[PDB]
Design a protein that fits this description.
This is part of a larger assembly, with 2 copies of chain A. Chain A is of the alpha+beta class. The first copy, chain A, has 9 helices and 8 strands. In chain A, strands 1-2-8-5-4 form a 5-stranded antiparallel beta sheet. A 3-stranded antiparallel beta sheet of chain A has the order 3-6-7. In chain A, helix 5 crosses helix 7. The structure holds calcium ion (3 copies) and zinc ion (ZN). The site of one calcium ion has 2 residues of chain A, from strand 4. Chain B: Keywords: Chromatin regulator, DNA recombination, DNA-binding, Endonuclease, Hydrolase, Isopeptide bond, Metal-binding, Multifunctional enzyme, Nuclease, Nucleus, Transferase, Ubl conjugation, Ubl conjugation pathway, Zinc, Zinc-finger.
Chain lengths: 270, 608
Amino acid sequence: RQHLLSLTRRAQKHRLRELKIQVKEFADKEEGGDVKAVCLTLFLLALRARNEHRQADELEAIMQGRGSGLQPAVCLAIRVNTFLSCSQYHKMYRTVKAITGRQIFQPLHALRNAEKVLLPGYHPFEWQPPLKNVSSRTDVGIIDGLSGLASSVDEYPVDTIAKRFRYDSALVSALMDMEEDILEGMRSQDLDDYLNGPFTVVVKESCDGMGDVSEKHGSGPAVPEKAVRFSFTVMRITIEHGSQNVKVFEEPKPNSELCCKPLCLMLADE
Amino acid sequence: RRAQKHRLRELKIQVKEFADKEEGGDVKAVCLTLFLLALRARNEHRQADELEAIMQGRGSGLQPAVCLAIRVNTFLSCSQYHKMYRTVKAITGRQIFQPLHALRNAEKVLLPGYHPFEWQPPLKNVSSRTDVGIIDGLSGLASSVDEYPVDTIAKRFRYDSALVSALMDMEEDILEGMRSQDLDDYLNGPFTVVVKESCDGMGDVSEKHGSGPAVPEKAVRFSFTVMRITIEHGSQNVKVFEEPKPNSELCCKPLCLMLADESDHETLTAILSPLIAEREAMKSSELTLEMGGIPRTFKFIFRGTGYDEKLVREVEGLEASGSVYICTLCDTTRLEASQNLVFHSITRSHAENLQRYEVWRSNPYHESVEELRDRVKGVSAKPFIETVPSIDALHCDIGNAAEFYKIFQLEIGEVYKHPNASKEERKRWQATLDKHLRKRMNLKPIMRMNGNFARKLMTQETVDAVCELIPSEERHEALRELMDLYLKMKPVWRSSCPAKECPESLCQYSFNSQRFAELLSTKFKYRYEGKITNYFHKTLAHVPEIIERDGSIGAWASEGNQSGNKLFRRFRKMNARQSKCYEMEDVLKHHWLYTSKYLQKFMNAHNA
Ligand SMILES: [Ca+2]
Ligand SMILES: [Ca+2]
Ligand SMILES: [Ca+2]
Ligand SMILES: [Zn+2]
């Protein structure tokens, strides 16, 4: 009844009960069941009466997800490319939060969710004609690499732990990881962005056995331990537009450490 | 814009008339709280709180101390921190994190050799400069082809500079302490500081850079910990400050660190002679140091306690640990320890050690070696550091737990009935106990007995399990009672303040240890007839007096240093320059930072 900075959440509630009544009724009858946008514009106008387009634009930005927010993909990029771990990222998160007051970084589960979108096994795709001897599922993630290899005391002994992606799902993920660049190159070559022609991809796959990936996690020089990575890269995407082929996309630096996507990891002598 | 103006002018006139009449025309805060609550309704507390901030107006970014705290308590490199910085700056558009040079400037303040201080009287043989930070630990040790070849890289702070930086690091905390104790902020009483000393020779601090597991290299880190600060208000000493977690990873301030075996006694003494000179100089002086305006007079008490038995015996001039003179507190023989279990006193100081070494080297009464060594109770070396008579706690409970593990392996085999077996039934007994315990408690056995193993093994349940492996009828109770008493005893020393954590155990400890001694002496004489291990002498006979002399036993222990070893390795590979000269002062600087407190109360801001 007196002021509002000191009036608590429910004290203000009882102060403007009737404000809330009128605004909610008018909103959900005029905008067809909505109150967010109307109270948003209401506060924008009632603060812009004091010509504060700085704060107006800042608030429209936070409503547009751009500014002091770090959308989860961005924080995931930082945590990956900075080699942070989850406990350390949580330390930094809570510290920046408690000091600033804002929430500049995003919590861990908002990174797991934004990660699920970037691995393989998320998008719906379909082959034609369907792939012989290949499954039809579309949520196939990290398969065991042995591929159901017979592992008992009766068959040829094998202890090489190995993980991999399914080739088709990983290739689909690698393509929808660069959808944006595909579309940008499509525009740049003066092509109708609404096109679905037979895009000819050109991939370059390569395995290379590395040596001595073992360490010293303890008091002992454990053993020589070798690994083998099979990997690939989307070298060049072309389309058969008109009567010719045009590079919708060409890899800038083909043989770079961060354009060679991993596909299979095994611990075995090459 | 014009569109929404038209669309909403009705609500406009409605809300404006109603809010102008209701609260007096303060539509600003009214509509503010309106949209706040409306947006919170749909669980948008993120956007609601950031809008509360944007209207309040505050702290869009951080200040350099916080960024420094983050990259130190997160172990970021400089390339990585810069990468994160520029990413956030380009995405947000603001500048939340601070550039690297800002963090170097905010770092120059928290390292030692920044503040002014004044010793009065001056420190004998110590310089008077105040800006001496990281200096070569060899202290100008002559290194030519003609000298005793030394090759140990070693960095150190000057001891007084280190203490000055620690004190003006915990300035805010001890000011808050005086506030809480109903004293004056502007009081300059002679603050007596009580510092703990701890040196521990961590080993195998190397890593394979290329091919070849050849060389193992060791290290030594000498460090201290401000343990309490106490002003003498009027005619009483009030505890302005006490360390919450005394033997903790991150209050053991590093002071000196070197790459050299802990038992390379010449090198060790070459490195630690200057430090001992400095800590002997600053025992008859008073640090004058302006702290929050007004200047204060500090006055120190050093206590060397973070020493495992090995270094205690090495740097006090005592025979190696497997001698006949077992206790480093009382001069008694192992045989006489087993005859008389708990009646000993504490009678081995440092001045006594020096004087006995003088007796040895001089040999005043002209007697052969085997009665001279009785005269000098096993002191045949010149004492080097002044440590105090005390028992470690970590190694104490580990040793006692290993001895119970041995007793278990013996009871399984019923060594009492048929003694003197061979060295195959021994391993059989061991594997039996191992398989049995791994089956019953998922307690997978290991060789280097750590603290988790000792923690799990020393439980009434473990004896209740292993009791199902002895054909006897009474060894059951003869282990049950034994474990009962050992557990009634463990908190007394393991506690960081047994006076106000378990005073019943403390007032019964004498009776419990005496009964424990009787029980070992009667139902276990087949083992403790001669040899009794050192820790079953310390634990049994000296705890109820180490308590009355120092308070606790758990606080004055080496755990704080034993943990820091982790950090070292990490730093040495993640934050260093491989230069073999800079590569060690970097580790030492970063460890000093990590151990700071003006940053731990930033990385603990989420709680408060
Ligand atoms: Ca190769
Ligand atoms: Ca040691
Ligand atoms: Ca150690
Ligand atoms: Zn003793």
